[PDB]
Write a protein that binds this ligand. Structure first.
Ligand SMILES: Nc1ncnc2c1ncn2[C@@H]1O[C@H](CO)[C@@H](O)[C@@H]1O
Ligand SMILES: Nc1ncnc2c1ncn2[C@@H]1O[C@H](CO)[C@@H](O)[C@@H]1O
Ligand SMILES: Nc1ncnc2c1ncn2[C@@H]1O[C@H](CO)[C@@H](O)[C@@H]1O
Ligand SMILES: Nc1ncnc2c1ncn2[C@@H]1O[C@H](CO)[C@@H](O)[C@@H]1O
Ligand SMILES: Nc1ncnc2c1ncn2[C@@H]1O[C@H](CO)[C@@H](O)[C@@H]1O
Ligand SMILES: Nc1ncnc2c1ncn2[C@@H]1O[C@H](CO)[C@@H](O)[C@@H]1O
Lengths: 237, 237, 237, 237, 237, 237
């Protein structure tokens, strides 16, 4: 057991899907995993392990922010033998042509956090995902007939930022989605020797202030999960 | 309701106690509040409202990290009329003369996060607590026969730091305890015109190592909460 | 015996009052101290030691700016056994409700200087005063029927700043007064393990030029010194 | 004609391969392009246009360093209709398992340059290549039976760096190759709206101080060019 | 008429000599100037104006540190029509070949202060002297049969720095002397369009403590003042 | 031979003139040197050696940008015995009173590059030229009846800057011309113990726009070279 996870080596699969919301992790287990059993509940951060088409798989929430997901991903990698981490969350769009419920794959992640500068002697560390995992997700999406843009995400420390002008800068440089974890998870993956990928579905528009509605939320969220789970199967082949 | 809190104005008291763990919020409401009702459960971040010696009081978790607690504290202050936030948590010690089960009060909070620089034109913003709240807590602690240390806390972004040299630095400049939120909460308090205070009990000595949990540890955690609750009453007069 | 102070261990009391203007040191010694004797003249920075109601106290100017006061406070602390430093000066206000002649106490001090970043591995060090000293000052003021605000000060490196926009920022974050030393003194105190406090009287409003009589100004200054001196006696009990 | 390129719209193909050495560009034209004609010689930065299997293609050197390649890539994109840029250069390895003449594909590029911070309001911009171009190069390499690692490169401003310790940091974070342009080219691509990719062949080892030798240089360099040219054909399909 | 100088336009010459120690201003006026008259006494920073071989010249101390001298130089330039400022002080050496009592002329000044970054949008501003003033000083020294080195000075914010390693760096880059004002004065001169120069005599070797007689020290000081004064006359021709 | 220069000790004079364009190096050798032989052609960066009025002199291009010229100048200094480097190039003007065809001498060079901060512990290193070389050039220019301006240059990393606001800044602080190398060369000179100087002719006014090239422009370029060559002879005596 680690400081934030009460479990033993073997309780988690070698691949773990992670939404920020622990309640969403429970939903994923009940909706997609077979023989799903709870493996963690410390601080209410629910974690589950089961199978998807005979493949052992785990799912656990990671909380909001780089500092929170950094704790959980690190402990999984160093004390539970987890080799691949797939964040499955929501994000805000800054580009006019990016629509609600769109699916985005972060090959890279920009950030205003200082964590990677602390790791990289104050220089620029390009926080990137594992290439094979990115390609697996693209193919899986293709097979499901679901569209998906591949590019840069922006991991923000402040959901309520006092610098609205920065959104113009994000847009100018082609940021596909604004979330709060990618850059940190990618930094941990590199520091502790594992592989990671972040997939998001546009839950709202930063400008239009339009947000998730109706039952489009479930279908779309379920599509993201399908892509993630299926992408792992391609990875195993 | 707000993006992360599904409740309405009036559901929260004008003073909120905030542990990092949602389950601790439930433990506090159950142990110290009378007629307590759950007022939020979004993302499992349980919030409650009840009364302490006739005084209307609320308690809700804030998750781990500056980005997390910044979201909740901001929503409380701007949408639920909250005027005071009192974080009640745990910290690691750096100073040798600081023993286990000591109660620490953060008059100020250092940090390796970039949020306050983003707010303050890249200069040094001294993240501090509200003076009257610090005095109220010091006075409540004395009335309970408990001696509290008042000084600087260090709010870290990485629980698992790559550095290590930074701890010699914290010790050299007198940091009393290391946690992950005070600096963020104090920044939010200043930005939106509210009042905040952070109180912590030493859970372990990053020096002599070994934490604390048992009868004596649990007794000290309860003293911290009584100090927080009693300080509110002093403030009311 | 020291590069900027020609005196020996024992010539200074363990408590020193420090105005910015050297001329004020002699005024304080003649007006408030008994049996005063000169203890320093190097570079014209006159120092005196005497007693106030029986308590041994010293007074000496520190010069304008962080670099200057950093030199004097360090030498006093490391070579003359000084335990407490109380800076007594003037400041400019940016908040509308802060009036001319108001007495301000800096529990913390923000700054655009780099000295603390150089000390704290380029992270954010919260430059704070000693809490007991702050409370002693507040109570001494109350006993003298004087109103005193406690909060953040801003220590500027440039009296004539090219960045006019920074004052709006200071106002937005509740800065009480603008001066040029606090954050530097607090940094030295933390570095060499001593205690410090900065008390200031509002000499001007950086937006609405006001007017004061020469007599009103001497009265306010004498009030600040009385607060400082009486606060020391409170700290002794 | 632009300040550094004497040519007119239409003289360059929509895709341009770029080695740092202009003499190498001439070699590529003579060895791989048909009906190759010189289109630029200003400052000796040779540029050529011809066909590869009926596909119109250009090749021009870009000089050494981010400031130099930034000039040329920008002018090609804004005044010559160039849509894809493929840098084909050499790099130094820092990882023990990365061998001489190995082929590396930079999906991302870290850097110690300040150019991207100047563009991204002093935050972290993840300098990444175009995903489709990366995948095209991987497939092309596969078809040719040539191996190729996909990952992060490090664009250095100083070939002769006074900070040797940084190489330990690069190695720790999995940097595949050390060159001097990738991060800048990726920044320009994003700023002016085009697509780019950097491919390198390990010409030496930073540690072992071993470098290119025998005729392995030509064969290996010719393999890189084959991958680049063929990857474009896949892109057109 | 100015916040730190109680005088009117015309009271100061268009050329001002400035020592750090206020006491030196009166010494220079009595020892080198004719028909001197006092023109300032605020805060004990005594100012004088007289003539040297017919030329009108003023002398006044500037206090220790960049913040202090920045205030005085700015006011003199913007409100008293001062065209040239010559700082005359002491410094510590880090280079072995730089001997005690050596006369050093700072053509440029490095610094660990943030004032120039605040002025120059966080980029590197090369704080330099006026070239003619530098050459005038060199020639005046030669005519007086005195040896003078011209190069870089380092303006420190902290006389007592916690970073001992920085002196090795200064030595490696050829720093001639360490003081605490040059870069600040040069910054002010550039900001308000005036000319400046800093001349210093080596008072100590920050590595090999030496010894000097009180008489040798007065001789060197008088030599520096003669160089400064004669350099002004050369500049007039 | 070195990594970028295929020559042997003795092939270069102890003084090298360096234009940015390789073709200009050929133009200079052909126009001003007698018995000139080509000594390098690696990457097309032509270098030559010959004599001027009996004095052994070399001239070689350095490419565009700090990273480029840093490579060549370092190799020359450490492997070919070069003791002086004189950059002879073009710059854009910012100050209105600075006209076309003016000869500018960079006593110092500001920059937006990070190379000197990397060398100088992240502090401000004042990149300056060698005093005697500046004086030699000023004296040679006078003997030729040419009036040269001596001051600060600004070495930019981006020829096509995203900012734009920075030019108002350069103008405000008196920058004489904008180029892309001086700061890098001065940093290399300090790091390896050599001497350097940069001379430029204004090719255009970033203000009034419109460059200069024709008889009068070419005459001024030749004057700069004569100034450089004649300054070497003065230095020899
Ligand atoms: N505009 C926005 N800015 C930052 N994060 C945003 C967001 N919209 C959705 N998110 C996603 O949900 C969480 C917080 O609501 C975050 O963890 C996650 O990024
Ligand atoms: N050494 C340490 N570093 C960082 N956070 C520490 C800590 N010791 C306790 N904490 C406290 O508990 C949470 C994470 O365990 C954090 O929310 C909170 O700060
Ligand atoms: N508006 C203002 N800005 C900065 N400093 C101010 C000030 N008003 C008074 N001061 C006080 O006097 C000194 C410098 O004038 C400083 O030491 C001290 O803060
Ligand atoms: N160790 C090293 N550090 C930096 N750049 C290196 C290199 N080895 C090869 N290069 C490649 O060739 C050019 C300079 O020789 C550079 O343009 C390119 O990066
Ligand atoms: N080693 C040293 N470091 C810093 N400043 C030094 C010094 N030796 C003399 N000084 C001179 O006296 C003042 C402060 O002592 C400074 O104004 C001035 O530079
Ligand atoms: N406005 C400007 N910005 C940057 N560099 C400038 C320039 N005007 C001329 N240059 C000079 O010519 C080269 C690039 O054209 C550069 O090497 C050299 O600096």
């Amino acid at each position: 057991a680690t400081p934030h996870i009460n479990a033993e080596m073997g309780d988690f699969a070698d691949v773990v899907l992670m939404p920020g919301d622990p309640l969403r992790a429970k939903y994923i287990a009940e909706t997609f995993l077979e023989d799903a059993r709870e493996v963690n509940n410390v601080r209410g951060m629910l974690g589950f392990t089961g199978t998807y088409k005979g493949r052992k798989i785990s799912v656990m929430g990671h909380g909001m922010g780089i500092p929170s997901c950094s704790i959980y991903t690190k402990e999984l990698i160093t004390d539970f033998g987890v080799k691949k981490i797939i964040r499955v969350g929501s994000c805000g769009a800054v580009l006019p042509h990016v629509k609600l419920r769109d699916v985005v794959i972060g090959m890279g992640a920009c950030t205003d956090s200082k964590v990677n500068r602390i790791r990289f002697k104050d220089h620029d560390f390009a926080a990137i995902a594992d290439f094979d995992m990115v390609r697996n997700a693209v193919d899986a999406a293709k097979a499901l007939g679901i569209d998906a843009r591949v590019g840069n995400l922006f991991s923000a420390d402040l959901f309520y930022s006092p610098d609205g002008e920065m959104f113009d800068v994000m847009e100018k440089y082609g940021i596909l989605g604004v979330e709060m974890e990618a850059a940190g998870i990618y930094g941990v993956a590199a520091e502790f020797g594992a592989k990671a990928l972040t997939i998001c579905t546009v839950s709202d528009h930063i400008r239009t202030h339009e947000q998730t509605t109706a039952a489009e939320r479930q279908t779309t969220f379920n599509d993201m999960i399908k892509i993630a789970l299926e992408s792992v199967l391609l990875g195993d082949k």
